Scaffold this active site. Structure first.
Site, PDB file in Angstrom:
ATOM      1  N   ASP A 123      31.633 -26.730  31.141  1.00 19.50           N
ATOM      2  CA  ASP A 123      31.321 -27.769  30.168  1.00 19.50           C
ATOM      3  C   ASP A 123      32.441 -28.804  30.136  1.00 19.50           C
TER       4      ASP A 123
ATOM      5  N   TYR B  56      26.048 -41.340  23.496  1.00 23.67           N
ATOM      6  CA  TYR B  56      25.553 -41.227  24.863  1.00 23.67           C
ATOM      7  C   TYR B  56      24.535 -42.320  25.169  1.00 23.67           C
ATOM      8  CZ  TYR B  56      27.937 -36.929  23.878  1.00 23.67           C
ATOM      9  OH  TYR B  56      28.879 -36.007  23.484  1.00 23.67           O
TER      10      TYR B  56
ATOM     11  N   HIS C 207      36.644 -31.320  19.224  1.00 28.74           N
ATOM     12  CA  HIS C 207      36.216 -29.972  19.606  1.00 28.74           C
ATOM     13  C   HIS C 207      37.313 -29.089  20.204  1.00 28.74           C
ATOM     14  CE1 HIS C 207      32.097 -30.517  18.478  1.00 28.74           C
ATOM     15  NE2 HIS C 207      31.913 -31.524  19.313  1.00 28.74           N
TER      16      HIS C 207
HETATM   17  C1  LIG Z   1      29.283 -31.121  24.305  1.00 27.38           C
HETATM   18  C2  LIG Z   1      28.195 -31.919  23.650  1.00 27.38           C
HETATM   19  C3  LIG Z   1      28.540 -33.009  22.722  1.00 27.38           C
HETATM   20  C4  LIG Z   1      29.656 -32.981  22.004  1.00 27.38           C
HETATM   21  C5  LIG Z   1      29.923 -34.115  21.101  1.00 27.38           C
HETATM   22  O1  LIG Z   1      29.116 -35.026  21.003  1.00 27.38           O
HETATM   23  N1  LIG Z   1      31.065 -34.088  20.423  1.00 27.38           N
HETATM   24  O2  LIG Z   1      31.381 -35.130  19.554  1.00 27.38           O
HETATM   25  C6  LIG Z   1      26.895 -31.693  23.887  1.00 27.38           C
HETATM   26  C7  LIG Z   1      26.342 -30.629  24.804  1.00 27.38           C
HETATM   27  C8  LIG Z   1      26.347 -29.262  24.132  1.00 27.38           C
HETATM   28  C9  LIG Z   1      24.924 -31.030  25.040  1.00 27.38           C
HETATM   29  O3  LIG Z   1      24.079 -30.840  24.180  1.00 27.38           O
HETATM   30  C10 LIG Z   1      24.549 -31.696  26.324  1.00 27.38           C
HETATM   31  C11 LIG Z   1      23.230 -32.074  26.527  1.00 27.38           C
HETATM   32  C12 LIG Z   1      22.867 -32.684  27.718  1.00 27.38           C
HETATM   33  C13 LIG Z   1      23.818 -32.918  28.706  1.00 27.38           C
HETATM   34  N2  LIG Z   1      23.439 -33.518  29.863  1.00 27.38           N
HETATM   35  C14 LIG Z   1      22.049 -33.909  30.050  1.00 27.38           C
HETATM   36  C15 LIG Z   1      24.407 -33.779  30.918  1.00 27.38           C
HETATM   37  C16 LIG Z   1      25.141 -32.535  28.500  1.00 27.38           C
HETATM   38  C17 LIG Z   1      25.508 -31.921  27.306  1.00 27.38           C
HETATM   39 ZN   LIG Z   2      28.934 -35.494  18.867  1.00 25.72          ZN
END
Ligand SMILES: CC(/C=C/C(=O)NO)=C\[C@@H](C)C(=O)c1ccc(N(C)C)cc1
Ligand SMILES: [Zn+2]
Ligand SMILES: [K+]
Ligand SMILES: [K+]
Length: 365
Positions: free
Chosen positions: A88, A293, A130
């Site tokens: 991750d 995102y 985090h």
């Molecule tokens: C780590 C995080 C956000 C943290 C945050 O925002 N901290 O502030 C989200 C992860 C669990 C997630 O749900 C995810 C979903 C899709 C993905 N891809 C489609 C590449 C990559 C990760």
């Molecule tokens: Zn977040």
């Protein structure tokens, strides 16, 4: 007096190098510049965090390990298992430098708050809540939020941390879980299977820090009006019970409608009203960015929020700049909520606020 804006061209380039979304810092700064907001703030060149400065929170073994796997891009080190590297949180080449700059930018902004250089210091590229002391998590290798707070601990005995990201700021709450000097408040989506999985209303801290951690579990589809009433009710209660002298604010944009997360249904206006309620405390405020995102949405949100801090009413039309074509098809600053239901029952919201009222009774008494 005038809001400090942490920026340098070298810093933005560093932030775009290993960012999750390409040109993350570029778009956000280019749009702020396009509204000529940089001319109304005090631009300060960020200083890269030293190993000792990071060591104020993170353990030595963890920091040495990052520095080793960052110089060659070793994503196959036998010690990475212990520190949460790196599925991750990839052990990409130059990741420690990336974390050093952002970590050092939050501390730099904190230093400006200490020396009375300003009442507000901004760092949009920062706010990764985090990361743990010896563990990376959720794209975060270095908890720059904790480093910022620890810098403010040199002058302030009462520090309020408010986390308005979509996700629970677990790394920050866990960092100050056993202390009453810093109270952490986190409004987030709380559902089974949703990252990071913690932050229930019953989570109030441990030891002498008990009742000094506040969590507001929120459900999908919440909009500006209901969110603000929740935020205002909590912050009013916290301000009276904790009496903070400084504030650290994390303003993630993954709550905004149109985000791939597709959970909360917020617009930058709603978060703006939350920011206003905190700014009127006349306290030393450290503004951080966070998750997000949808690049253009992050830019629209944080640019508007910069306008809120300055009190300027921005033009609804996106001015022509470097990344103008990324704002299709409407090319406006406003963001409209999506057609999704609000799954937050008014009774459950009130039931949570009452728990918090009950928990903060212990603090004031
Ligand atoms: C780590 C995080 C956000 C943290 C945050 O925002 N901290 O502030 C989200 C992860 C669990 C997630 O749900 C995810 C979903 C899709 C993905 N891809 C489609 C590449 C990559 C990760
Ligand atoms: Zn977040
Ligand atoms: K949050
Ligand atoms: K605490």
């Amino acid at each position: 007096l005038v809001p400090v804006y942490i920026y340098s061209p070298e810093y933005v380039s560093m932030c775009d190098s290993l960012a999750k979304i390409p040109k993350r810092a570029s778009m956000v700064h280019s749009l702020i510049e396009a509204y000529a907001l940089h001319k109304q703030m005090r631009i300060v060149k960020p200083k890269v965090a030293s190993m000792e400065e990071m060591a104020t929170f993170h353990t030595d073994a963890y920091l040495q390990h990052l520095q080793k796997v960052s110089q060659e891009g070793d994503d196959d080190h036998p010690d990475s298992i212990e520190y949460g590297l790196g599925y991750d949180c990839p052990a990409t080449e130059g990741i420690f430098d990336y974390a050093a700059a952002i970590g050092g930018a939050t501390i730099t902004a904190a230093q400006c708050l200490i020396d009375g250089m300003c009442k507000v210091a901004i760092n949009w590229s920062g706010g990764w809540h985090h990361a743990k002391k010896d563990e990376a998590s959720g794209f975060c290798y270095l908890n720059d939020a904790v480093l910022g707070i620890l810098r403010l601990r040199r002058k302030f005995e009462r520090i309020l941390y408010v986390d308005l990201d979509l996700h629970h700021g677990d790394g920050v709450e866990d960092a100050f879980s056993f202390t009453s000097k810093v109270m952490t408040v986190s409004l987030h989506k709380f559902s089974p299977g949703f990252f990071p999985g913690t932050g229930d209303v019953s989570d109030v801290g441990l030891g002498k820090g008990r009742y000094y951690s506040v969590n507001v579990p929120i459900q999908d589809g919440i909009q500006d009006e209901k969110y603000y009433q929740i935020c205002e009710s909590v912050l009013k209660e916290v301000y009276q019970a904790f009496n903070p002298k400084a504030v650290v604010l994390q303003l993630g944009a993954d709550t905004i409608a149109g985000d791939p997360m597709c959970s909360f249904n917020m617009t930058p206006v709603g978060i703006g009203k939350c920011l206003k309620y905190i700014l009127q405390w006349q306290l030393a405020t450290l503004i951080l960015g966070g998750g997000g995102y949808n690049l253009a949405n992050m830019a629209r949100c944080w640019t508007y929020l910069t306008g809120v801090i300055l009190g300027k009413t921005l033009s609804s039309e996106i001015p022509d700049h470097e990344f103008f074509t990324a704002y299709g098809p409407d090319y406006v600053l406003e963001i409209t909520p999506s057609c999704r239901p609000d799954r937050n029952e008014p009774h459950r919201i009130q039931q949570i606020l009452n728990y918090i009222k009950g928990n903060l009774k212990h603090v004031v008494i």
